[model samples]
Target: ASMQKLINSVQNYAWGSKTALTELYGIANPQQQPMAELWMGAHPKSSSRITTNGETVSLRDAIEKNKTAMLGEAVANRFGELPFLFKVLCAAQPLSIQVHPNKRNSEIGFAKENAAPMERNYKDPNHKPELVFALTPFLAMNAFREFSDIVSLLQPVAGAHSAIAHFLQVPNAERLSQLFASLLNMQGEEKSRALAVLKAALNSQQGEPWQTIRVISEYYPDDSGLFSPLLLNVVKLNPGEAMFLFAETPHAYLQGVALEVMANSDNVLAAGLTPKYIDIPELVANVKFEPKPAGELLTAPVKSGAELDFPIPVDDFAFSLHDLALQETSIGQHSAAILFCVEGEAVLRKDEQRLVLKPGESAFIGADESPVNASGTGRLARVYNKL
Candidate 1:
């Protein structure tokens, strides 16, 4: 099979930026819907489409028709489908505070939900562990804060606030978990009173934490997630920096654009800050209570020639950035791969077939396509199975 151009779909979610996709990636958005994500894989929700020989087909159907040719034998046998989904996420506002279940939990939850006679949250029976490579300055609330830090931040507000002060008495993961549960479950005037104290404390404080609290509160006033900044570790990623969020890690992207690669699943258990369903118990059960240090959150890119590999621990997917400025680069045949041009223009060649990709354009290359070459003055990001 030859490398073929792909027509990807964009998700228009409420929290997305109206300008990022259009201005930065050069995507056409005449409807001006909030372009939340550009999905580039064979997930049933919004699979990328490919046109070849004047015939148009969904990427999912193409892969299903010839799994071995598209995904390679090992991957097809192990995953039974495309193992990863690539996306460009643009967040103009804070996303929901959510957690992804681990593989075992996903399987169990999915089965349990299917057995039930009511609507359920699990969308698929696969876990989603993702990596975010920043295209611009990005802000996120990742993992839990240190128990000590959490106490310190809550202490000042606790003095005048009984609800917060109640949690300060106990300084362990168990207590923190209890505190989070109580806050998420609060209602009526009590929730409003506690939030007022929180806002006051945040306004009186200084530094990045204060700024984060202020910003989130501004976007989602009186929302329980305003207190999230104090509970979660604040992460700021400059362009090119990347972070990995393992399954069960409680996190949310606050603002800015990033290239996100994850396992092919949409089973998100949101805890707060949206009109979406808030499955607090499920989210808390899936969350890892341990605090992750800022240093551990970032993955240092490993550079090899023009490619910078963003190493992640999962076998489902691997991501790399290629800079082909006045030079040509070739990547050996791998399982199914997707290349997206974010800047400039590039010519992709596989055997006798060739396709030129302009800014915002993407292509899907099958596993059978060997020694795929890209050349021209452009920057491209590639996603493939790690195996």
Candidate 2:
């Protein structure tokens, strides 16, 4: 049984909170750089570091050396490597509104980009389906709203009229996609005029989406993407609540920290409220325009003893939260996994090999350590393969 503690990489992005990671993990930002994401997997880019036996090496290197031992036969053969990337996302402000392409598009885009020269997108040939569990008071926008609710909400936004009119002209079934593409593609004068009206309307409102609008303005005031609040469903996940973001879904983190796990990919077509590239045409080509009801956005975990198993729809990753206050947890994970202790000290063991993890600390367990045991105090975040 091979299991060693991991030394994760911290990414500093502008939207990240300066204090969240520090408070949670004792991560330092002396110059107050935005410590955005704490990555805890083999991403090939910012992989976690570990000491195998005695030599310090990247997790990717260790896995490549003994694939079957690191990832089980099923997972090793299926994904050929680590299929998932786990992260601790700290958002002090909203992330640029963005959507990821599905598996087919992912494969196509990577193949296409590899064959051509005009390419800066498409990082890997894999789809990214995310499941984020709140570690704090998390806020986000997930997908489009129900058509009727969208219509009602837009009724107040004077800027949305032209787009809504254009939408109504489309065949009823095609209205959603048409509106999204139209709203996001507005250019020059029309874009400024429409966004100004939406800004005015957003300012006049009191609750919810309006408050979110203020949050958006805190960082990105000029970007037309700020109108995203009026268009997407606002999800406020209390600590412990979780949500699954499938491929092609329009979503953005508004605020707070979360433990996120996803397929190993880096293809994001940004749309709004971001200073980043607003690739409207690419986003339209890749994003899902279908409206999903707000009620269906949050994922509810299934209870199993002290654990809350968050069921993932994709085959890439599985997530669970375990309470270690009372007893030891026998984690029956079949694939390689990253065990992150979220709140208190946790003692992890597989046979005689023992490791103690504190809050914000993590351990990488090879597949050979199947059904690893955990005990001690507080909560643990368990991430592994669905297969």
Candidate 3:
């Protein structure tokens, strides 16, 4: 009886696509404003709205009105409200290469910034580790490639820089750091010269790696991050595939739409590919330069009849995909959930009360509505607190 349909708010950002949201969800935009993300949870930045008993109210206020019923006893005691923020993200241009602070680091940064000559960087004291599940063929630059692989690609492009030469000789972590610092910290004509060489080098090649460099160059011609794809693993996710973006890992979304869920925090350190300030010093310390294979970046689904769960390693959230197809399936027996319908129609029922969701519609299911049965032709995306 506590389950209710929600109307989410769309966020406009410069990198957002103007038409993708409209094409996918029939979202109207007579003004042609860029729709970057359609936020579905209560984060204060943008909270979902629902009509309850008669009046329209924010989801946060509705949850606050009956905390235990909405968030459950254990959840209310552990965390005052929801632990995660969910959104359907659409990107037309590349976002900044960035890394999030871990729990401990976020705590320190939050306090330090509040007491700053430095201006604030953190919005809260919680860590933000997120997952991006592709709805289209999405592209991203993930964490560092192997130590040897970075050295191999960069050596030919880096020319006579002493840092590269020494890294080639010693082939160690400190040397790799020096090599990275040299490339990223380049300024003025020095930076342009280095990028010019890469553009010329990539112009002759074919395939994704070279193509990525070319595409970014069109928007941000002098940006140092243009060569960064060579140092990081460039990955593309087909529709239905997803990847985890952990704390202290450097990554950037190149293009395409996806579903994003993260801890309810905002503490990010910029790396590159934006007009925003790049805190080079903080980024140098925060990023883990360790090697990670591209294959390890994906999280495969664990099937359970009508549901396909993506097992993630955080306490904040878990994601699942459903194809009920008129067969009644059960979910959220003792948990709180935010269910979003992506295709066709989804029928959510509890005790005889019913709410039907069309494409792009979402609903918040309180613990009071436990074990709701779902059916219909639609495919649904469900997000729940792992707590």
Q: Model 1 off-target regions past 4 Å? A: 117-119, 159-163
Clashing pairs in 3: none
Indicate the residue-level lDDT of 35 in model 3.
Answer: 94
The lDDT of each candidate is: 0.84, 0.82, 0.82
How would you encode candidate 1's per-residue C-alpha lDDT over 1-387 as one tens digit per residue?
Answer: 388899898899977888998898677888789989989998797789998768889999999999998988878999989899898999998888778999999999999899853347787788998999888899998888888888888876675345567778877877778778777877888788888787777767888787988878777896877777888899999988899988888889998999999987878888777756587788788887888876788998899899989888889898898998656689754698899886889998877887899887899988888568889886889898867
Error of 2 at 73 (Å): 0.5
**Candidates sorted by TM-score, descending order?**
3, 1, 2
The positional error of residue 310 in candidate 3, measured at the CA in angstroms, is: 1.0
TM-score leader = 3
User: Candidate 2, which ten residues in sequence have the lowest lDDT sum?
Assistant: 165-174
Q: Tens digit of lDDT per residue, candidate 2, span 207-255?
A: 9788888788878876666667766899999998999998888899888
Q: For candidate 2, give the lDDT of residue 133.
A: 90
Model 1 residue 126 CA deviation in Å? 1.1
For the record, the alpha-carbon RMSD of candidate 1 to the native fold, in angstroms, is: 1.9
Shift of residue 160 alpha carbon in model 1, Å: 6.5
